[PDB]
DNA sequence: AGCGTGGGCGT
DNA sequence: TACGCCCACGC
């Protein structure tokens, strides 16, 4: 089996290569949200998704456009990616 | 646009 | 086990 770790929840055939993505996954079923924003008290299933959320409060935008003459900055990498693909297109 | 929230992955 | 990235979908 290329993905030995199967989810044993009702009507879920999801499988993974490693054990930790299975645990992360299973927080969908249980609604468990370990991490919490200290600003708006909102809780999140994943710590990385919390840190990006925090930037909605702080206004931090670590991702700059590499295109010349462009000063656009973004909070997440995927936003910069969508922006970069907007230039080349 | 701005961002919630998934999987895949390196370390 | 953990953190922190990329990438992606879908409003
Ligand atoms: Zn499952
Ligand atoms: Zn918040
Ligand atoms: Zn740009």
Residue numbers in the entry: 349 to 437
Sentences from the paper on this structure:
We investigated the response of the zinc finger DNA-binding domains of transcription factors early growth response protein 1 (Egr1) and Wilms tumor protein 1 (WT1) to different forms of modified cytosine within their recognition sequence, 5′-GCG(T/G)GGGCG-3′. The three ZnFs of both proteins bind in the major DNA groove. The C-terminal fingers (ZnF3 of Egr1 and ZnF4 of WT1) interact with the 5′ triplet (GCG), the middle fingers (Egr1-ZnF2 and WT1-ZnF3) interact with the central triplet (TGG), and the N-terminal fingers (Egr1-ZnF1 and WT1-ZnF2) interact with the 3′ triplet (modified GCG). We kept both strands of the 5′ GCG triplet in an unmodified state and modified both strands of the 3′ GCG triplet.
Finally, we were interested in variants that strongly distinguish only one modification. Another variant that we examined (“PP”) has proline at position −4 in WT1 ZnF2 and ZnF4 in place of Q369 and E427. This variant displayed a high preference for 5mC compared with both oxidized C and unmodified C by factors ranging from 40 to 140. The selectivity of the PP WT1 variant for 5mC compared with C stems not from an increase in affinity for 5mC but a >100-fold decrease in affinity for C. Interestingly, the mismatch repair endonuclease MutH also uses a proline to juxtapose a methyl group in its hemimethylated recognition sequence, one that occurs on adenine rather than on C in this case.
